[PDB]
Amino acid sequence: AGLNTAAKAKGLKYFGSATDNPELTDSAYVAQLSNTDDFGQITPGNSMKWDATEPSQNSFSFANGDAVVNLANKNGQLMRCHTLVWHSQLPNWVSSGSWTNATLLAAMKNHITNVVTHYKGKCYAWDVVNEALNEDGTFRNSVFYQIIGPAYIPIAFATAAAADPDVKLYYNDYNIEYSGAKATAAQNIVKMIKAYGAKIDGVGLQAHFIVGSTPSQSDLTTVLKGYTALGVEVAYTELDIRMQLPSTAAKLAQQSTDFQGVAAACVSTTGCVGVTIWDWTDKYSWVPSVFQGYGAPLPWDENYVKKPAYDGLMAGLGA
Numbered sequence: 071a072g073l074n075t076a077a078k079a080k081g082l083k084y085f086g087s088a089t090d091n092p093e094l095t096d097s098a099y100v101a102q103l104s105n106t107d108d109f110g111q112i113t114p115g116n117s118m119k120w121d122a123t124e125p126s127q128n129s130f131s132f133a134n135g136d137a138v139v140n141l142a143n144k145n146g147q148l149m150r151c152h153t154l155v156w157h158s159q160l161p162n163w164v165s166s167g168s169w170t171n172a173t174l175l176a177a178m179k180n181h182i183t184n185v186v187t188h189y190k191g192k193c194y195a196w197d198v199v200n201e202a203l204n205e206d207g208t209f210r211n212s213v214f215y216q217i218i219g220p221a222y223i224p225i226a227f228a229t230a231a232a233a234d235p236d237v238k239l240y241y242n243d244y245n246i247e248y249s250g251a252k253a254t255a256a257q258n259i260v261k262m263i264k265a266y267g268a269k270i271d272g273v274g275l276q277a278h279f280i281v282g283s284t285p286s287q288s289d290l291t292t293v294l295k296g297y298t299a300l301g302v303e304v305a306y307t308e309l310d311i312r313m314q315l316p317s318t319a320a321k322l323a324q325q326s327t328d329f330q331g332v333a334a335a336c337v338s339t340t341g342c343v344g345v346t347i348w349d350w351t352d353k354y355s356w357v358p359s360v361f362q363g364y365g366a367p368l369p370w371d372e373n374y375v376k377k378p379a380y381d382g383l384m385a386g387l388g389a
């Protein structure tokens with residue numbers, strides 16, 4: 071019947087979508103987001119981030135986060151919860167602080183504990199640390215890395231696990247889906263967390279790809295199995311395949327095969343629990359405001375009509 075039914079028929083836990091609170095007032099949007107044939111899982115695109123949930127130190131704010139959880143709960147959809155520690159979308163107080171390791175650690179741990187405890191039992195997974203790597207595999211020079219060093223990462227995992235020992239804890243990043251230094255460095259994060267003694271359950275592969283320049287099914291698969299070999303699960307967490315505009319029939323058809331390989335790479339890897347697309351309609355994609363001249367990235371168009379990429383996805387899922 072749809073993406074999520076197809077996914078689950080192959081053994082995946084879900085096919086799902088991100089959304090954002092402003093979109094939840096659009097009734098046609100909400101009807102299709104709530105269609106469990108297509109979507110068994112939801113991620114908040116913004117309202118679980120640090121700026122949203124801890125706008126002043128020790129002053130937490132959950133209304134926007136909880137409204138997306140309430141929508142998933144209404145529909146019987148799973149949640150992925152995103153994200154506890156990331157260099158982007160920090161409030162002023164974190165980025166302007168004069169910190170020591172001790173003071174930043176305490177603020178970081180308190181942020182994780184509060185937000186994880188709040189959502190205890192409500193999330194299938196947390197993206198505990200997002201985008202910790204540079205493209206060469208070195209560590210990104212965030213405030214956390216500068217002040218705390220590499221240990222920020224396992225400490226973040228340990229703190230999340232203490233607060234909610236049942237939820238799957240993921241490391242999430244982009245450009246870790248194809249073979250190369252960054253992917254290798256992502257395997258090394260997995261290793262490092264466990265060497266610390268901290269828990270990590272999964273690797274999140276963002277999968278912000280480009281039409282006609284998408285990793286091949288064989289390399290995607292090699293890379294997924296490179297993670298599952300380590301004793302973790304994997305998921306594609308923010309899949310979108312942006313095209314250089316203008317849209318054409320030929321680019322739509324390439325987009326289909328590109329999405330098809332992603333689905334099929336996940337099916338072919340035991341331990342790939344699911345795919346989430348980064349929203350589901352071109353109308354609300356984040357792409358055009360970030361990647362100038364690119365757009366039309368998703369399986370439905372801006373009028374909420376299925377594109378050929380929907381059929382590519384179904385085909386990759388063996389449906």
Ligand SMILES: O[C@@H]1[C@@H](O)[C@H](O[C@@H]2CO[C@@H](O)[C@H](O)[C@H]2O)OC[C@H]1O
Pocket residue numbers: 244245278279280
């Ligand atoms: O802010 C982050 C973006 O920088 C990131 O951009 C990536 C650049 O490399 C490209 O090949 C990837 O496709 C593209 O996503 O995406 C995630 C975002 O948070």
Ligand SMILES: *[C@@H]1O[C@H](CO)[C@@H](O)[C@H](O)[C@H]1NC(C)=O
Pocket residue numbers: 171172175217218219221
């Ligand atoms: C910060 O403190 C923790 C111990 O709590 C330690 O693991 C880490 O190396 C420290 N980092 C720095 C840069 O001093």
